[PDB]
């Protein structure tokens, strides 16, 4: 009836680490024409009403976000998703030009949980300051994950969930400067993305971010990676090079595809001349992107009129760190993301599958 | 309109198999949930097996897992259904169905293919 | 069939019958996906309800569907000579369980 059922067990029952193929479920509504909608209705099952928690007190289970085969199948989902729903003009791939139709769609994501079938259950990690790699001491038991909005995006993450107690750093190998960095928060700032409807150039958009909440949200993130390379001076940069969907934030508002410039989101200066109002980062809507799903380019058709509008809650914070500098007073920072498996991690992190018998 | 053609039903004996097709027509078939639903000869109906619109999620019932298995071929606009190790017990009309959505009402059916269990 | 419907219903013409669908708490009673079905004899069942209470294009409005507890009702009025048929109900009823169906019920015309 009302959200969540909790309960108790000792002892009992023996399980295994497996993996097994999750179904998603969500409150997709039939009669939407939304695309995610339109999607997850045939994707997946309805949310249970009466989800189901047990503490499986006493426990202590090893956890690994890095290695976790519930990330490879919602990459696997939401590739479906786009495949079926942001069909490109013109996909320049497996060396073909792949024409097929465009039609500009309503797109806004809604959650998805993932579950289990007969015979297995998702395992949870309560330990509230848990970075996602080895052991857990408050476990619990599931039947589904908690709603994870498919939100596909770089450097910035968008509307996912926040770490409960304090900001935690999570990284396969943090000493592996090669190795992706992601930032749970603790608060989230909104980043309020608009294309004005001018009635002119169609594709200069902005966001706009409280400057104020966030260069104190970004100081504490600076002195929690503080804390993991021995009081260090921790650097902010912009991204070194490459694609601009990975020197960007990139994501998709309302099906348009933005990419906005986050320089002025890393300034070290604020971390007080200026800095305290409102940053303002000049985005560009593009029709020729290269694809997240698999390689290659695609064009989508020109831009809707009116006023496009997304405000997205940042819930974390995907950086590389430089290396080399090791060595140094220092350690740099940069604006990262573009493997995709990354956003879904930073919230499947928590969750583990396992077989019962 | 919809339309969806059952095919591949007939008499078979104990623990042997058949392979069940329908074919899709009238309706983009990638994009919605299909299910087939049996019907013993003067029973009611039961749900057999359902499957996501993309193929990668099947759901199947208990008095028939493990021996059937739903597939789809989205190229072909194909629905399938093996079913291995029959008893005669599964003896029925064999209807294959367009969902509402996965999991919810099924708004058009085919004609259905008697499947015969009979030693 | 984990949905109780009644082995057969009779009326009179131009009068109303309802048809009862009985399930528990985790199916009926947990979602809002109860759908009806008419079968003639040796046809393919029809979708005569959707969604507890929608009705598809072209379906007559005599039919109409509604929920209370763990019970749906199905409901024709104006009852004419070829409503007689068998009826199945039918919900959602979570990840495990995914679909029931009633029992069916036989509807007849008296005279």
């Known amino acids: 009836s009302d959200n969540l059922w909790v309960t108790v067990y000792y002892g009992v029952p023996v399980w295994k680490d497996a993996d097994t193929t999750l179904f998603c479920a969500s409150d997709a509504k039939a009669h939407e024409t939304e695309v995610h909608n339109v999607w997850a209705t045939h994707a997946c099952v309805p949310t249970d009403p009466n989800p189901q928690e047990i503490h499986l007190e006493n426990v202590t289970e090893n956890f690994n976000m890095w290695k976790n085969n519930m990330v490879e199948q919602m990459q696997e989902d939401v590739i479906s998703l786009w495949d079926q729903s942001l069909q490109p003009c013109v996909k320049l791939t497996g060396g073909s030009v792949i024409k097929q139709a465009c039609p500009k769609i309503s797109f806004d994501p809604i959650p998805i949980h993932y579950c289990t079938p007969a015979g297995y259950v998702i395992l949870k990690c309560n330990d509230k300051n848990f970075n996602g790699t080895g052991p857990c001491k408050n476990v619990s038991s599931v039947q589904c994950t908690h709603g994870i909005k498919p939100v596909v995006s770089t450097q910035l993450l968008l509307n996912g969930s926040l770490a409960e107690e304090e900001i935690i750093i999570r990284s396969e190998n943090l000493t592996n400067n090669a190795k992706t960095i992601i930032v749970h928060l603790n608060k989230s700032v909104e980043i309020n993305c608009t294309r004005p409807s001018n009635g002119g150039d169609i594709r200069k958009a902005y966001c706009e971010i409280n400057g104020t909440k966030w260069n104190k949200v970004l100081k504490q993130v600076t002195e929690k990676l503080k804390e993991h390379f021995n009081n260090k001076t921790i650097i902010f940069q912009p991204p070194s090079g490459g694609d601009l969907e990975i020197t960007m934030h990139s994501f998709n508002c309302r099906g348009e595809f933005f990419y906005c410039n986050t320089t002025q989101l890393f300034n070290n200066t604020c971390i007080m001349k200026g800095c305290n109002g409102t940053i303002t980062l000049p985005c560009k809507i593009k029709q020729i992107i290269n694809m997240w799903q698999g390689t290659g380019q695609a064009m989508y058709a020109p831009p809707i009129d009116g006023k496009i509008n997304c405000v997205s809650n940042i819930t974390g914070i995907l950086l590389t760190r430089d290396g080399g500098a090791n060595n140094t007073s220092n350690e740099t920072f940069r604006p990262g993301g573009g493997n995709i498996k990354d956003n879904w991690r930073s919230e499947l992190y928590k969750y583990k599958v396992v077989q019962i018998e | 309109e919809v339309q969806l053609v059952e095919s591949g039903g007939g008499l078979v004996q104990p623990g042997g198999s058949l392979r069940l097709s329908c074919a899709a027509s009238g309706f983009t078939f990638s994009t919605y949930a299909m299910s087939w639903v049996r019907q013993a000869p003067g029973k009611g109906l039961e749900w057999v097996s359902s499957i996501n619109n993309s193929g990668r999620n099947t759901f199947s019932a208990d008095s028939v897992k493990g021996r059937f298995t739903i597939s789809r071929d989205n190229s072909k606009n194909t629905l399938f259904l093996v079913m291995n190790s029959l008893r005669a017990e599964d003896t029925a009309v064999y209807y294959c169905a367009k969902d509402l959505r996965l999991g919810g009402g099924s708004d058009y059916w085919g004609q259905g293919t008697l499947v015969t269990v009979s030693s | 069939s984990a949905l109780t419907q009644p082995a057969s219903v009779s009326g009179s013409p131009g009068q109303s019958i309802t048809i009862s669908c009985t399930g528990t708490?985790?199916?009926?009673?947990?979602?809002?996906?109860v759908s009806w079905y008419q079968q003639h004899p040796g046809k393919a069942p029809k979708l005569m309800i959707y969604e507890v209470s929608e009705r598809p294009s072209g379906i007559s409005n005599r039919f109409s569907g509604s929920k209370s507890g763990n019970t749906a009702s199905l409901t024709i009025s104006g009852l004419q000579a070829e409503d007689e048929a068998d009826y199945y109900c039918?919900?959602?009823?979570?990840?495990?369980?995914?679909?029931?169906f009633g029992g069916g019920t036989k509807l007849t015309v008296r005279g």
């Open positions: 039918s919900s959602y009823a979570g990840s495990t369980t995914f679909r029931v």
């Open positions: 708490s985790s199916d009926v009673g947990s979602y809002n996906f």
